[PDB]
């Protein structure tokens, strides 16, 4: 069969997850001798798969893209995700990515939020409240001091949302990441 | 030794082996003194005496480019392959210098698409089939490509603004104007 019709019956057939990232899972399955490598953004039906212990109930579906400038990582990182990459030894295996089949290998890269998100200053609430709006179905934001471990703090929102800043965020170091954007949260005493 | 990029840049004197060559960077490892340094660079200079240097490009293109995330858009936006640094699935990372910047991740090769800010506009002068691309970046690329066409090493780099006159062979409905983060279908016309 085709992997994108075979990698979905994980519950049915013997499966084994190989890697759990911040935003998708890499698992394979065995259907009558054949082995099917594949990656998905949905944890539905991967509990009878071997190595499911650290699997989250849900995977954040925000828009994410790999980070290419290694300096930007400490500031823009919001976790890791799995991606299809070309094999260096010219031996790509067949792997299905989010129900899309292709030949390649699987690699885990650090990622950053991406997409169109507009960040304005609110008027209804206190001076430390902002209004983030995005045209895409689901957009992620994250308040992060550069170098913090807050990979699961990525909040998702459809349409618009509002964020009142807390005092611990109000030092000049914290930055608001929303898709392609990064705004400094001003220091105010 | 503590500063890794120095042995990386001194490959011409050391024993270097090219481990891979993409469309825009080269992956090579050097051994200064019984210690192997893994390395990725965009300058083919100093690697000619490395092993597996036969297909080394004369020079590499500097146009901004990023990995293709939606594998369905690969056939359309592909501009070649480029090496990037990633993490190890077995959690066995090893130090690697990327464009003179040192880190502990592993090396991956990924089909890549043009990126950057590029503005496509009508020329309003001369031939009707003439368009103008505008980019504020120092370096920006553009490439007329048939969804599928193998035009990897034929991407034109333009600083500031540039103008391109559509050839008649390119004026069928099977061609896109690729420039930075933008793609625009050229018209099937006669
Ligand atoms: C289980 O796999 C079958 C192929 O046998 C495919 O139709 C589908 O992905 C799964 N079942 C259903 C009812 O969708
Ligand atoms: C993998 O490559 C083979 C040829 O080597 C090709 O026939 C096959 O279609 C490719 N896999 C997919 C999912 O297209
Ligand atoms: C590169 O190698 C030379 C020896 O040829 C050595 O002096 C040093 O490691 C490098 N060159 C410098 C630092 O000028
Ligand atoms: C990561 O690499 C740097 C230099 O490449 C090194 O200083 C550091 O110790 C490495 N990390 C670990 C956990 O060893």
Give the SSE layout.
Two copies of one chain form a homodimer.
Chain A: H1 3-6, E1 14-20, E2 25-31, E3 34-40, E4 64-66, H2 73-76, E5 77-85, E6 93-97, E7 100-113, E8 118-121, E9 129-133, E10 139-144, E11 155-157, E12 160-164, E13 175-178, E14 181-184
Parallel strand pairs in A: 3-6
Antiparallel strand pairs in A: 1-2, 2-3, 4-7, 5-7, 6-7, 8-9, 9-12, 10-11, 10-13, 13-14
Write structural notes for this entry:
The structure is a homodimer. Chain A has 189 residues and is mainly beta. Chain A folds into two domains: 3-112, no CATH class; 115-184. Chain A has helices at 3-6, 73-76, and strands at residues 14-20, 25-31, 34-40, 64-66, 77-85, 93-97, 100-113, 118-121, 129-133, 139-144, 155-157, 160-164, 175-178, 181-184. In chain A, the strands form three sheets. In chain A, strands 1, 2, 3, 4, 5, 6 and 7 form a seven-stranded mixed β-sheet that branches. In chain A, strands 11-10-13-14 form a four-stranded antiparallel β-sheet, with no helix packed on it. In chain A, strands 8-9-12 form a three-stranded antiparallel β-sheet, with no helix packed on it. Chain A is elongated. Chain A binds chain B through residues 18-19, 26, 65-66, 68, 70-71, 80, 83-88, 97, 100, 102, 106-110, and chain B through 19-20, 27, 66-67, 69, 71-72, 81, 84-89, 98, 101, 103, 106-111. The site of one 2-acetamido-2-deoxy-beta-D-glucopyranose has 3 residues of chain A, from loops. Chain A: It comes from Tomato spotted wilt virus (TSWV). Chain A: Belongs to the tospovirus envelope glycoprotein family.
């Amino acid at each position: 069969s085709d992997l994108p019709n075979n990698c979905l019956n994980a519950s049915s057939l013997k499966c084994e997850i190989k890697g759990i990232s911040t935003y998708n899972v890499y698992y394979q399955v065995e259907n009558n001798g054949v082995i099917y490598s594949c990656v998905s953004d949905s944890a539905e039906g991967l509990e009878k798969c071997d190595n499911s212990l650290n699997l989250p109930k849900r995977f954040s579906k925000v828009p994410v893209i790999p980070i290419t400038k290694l300096d930007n990582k400490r500031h823009f990182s919001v976790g890791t995700k799995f991606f299809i990459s070309e094999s260096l030894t010219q031996d790509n295996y067949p792997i299905t990515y989010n129900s899309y089949p292709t030949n390649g290998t699987v690699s885990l890269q650090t990622v950053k939020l991406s997409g169109d998100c507009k960040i304005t200053k609110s008027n209804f609430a206190n001076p430390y409240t902002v209004s983030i709006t995005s045209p895409e179905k689901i957009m992620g934001y994250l308040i992060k001091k550069p170098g913090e471990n807050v990979e699961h703090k990525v909040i998702s929102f459809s349409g618009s949302a509002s964020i009142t800043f807390t005092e611990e965020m109000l030092d000049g170091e914290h930055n608001l990441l929303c898709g392609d954007k990064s705004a400094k949260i001003p220091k105010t005493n």
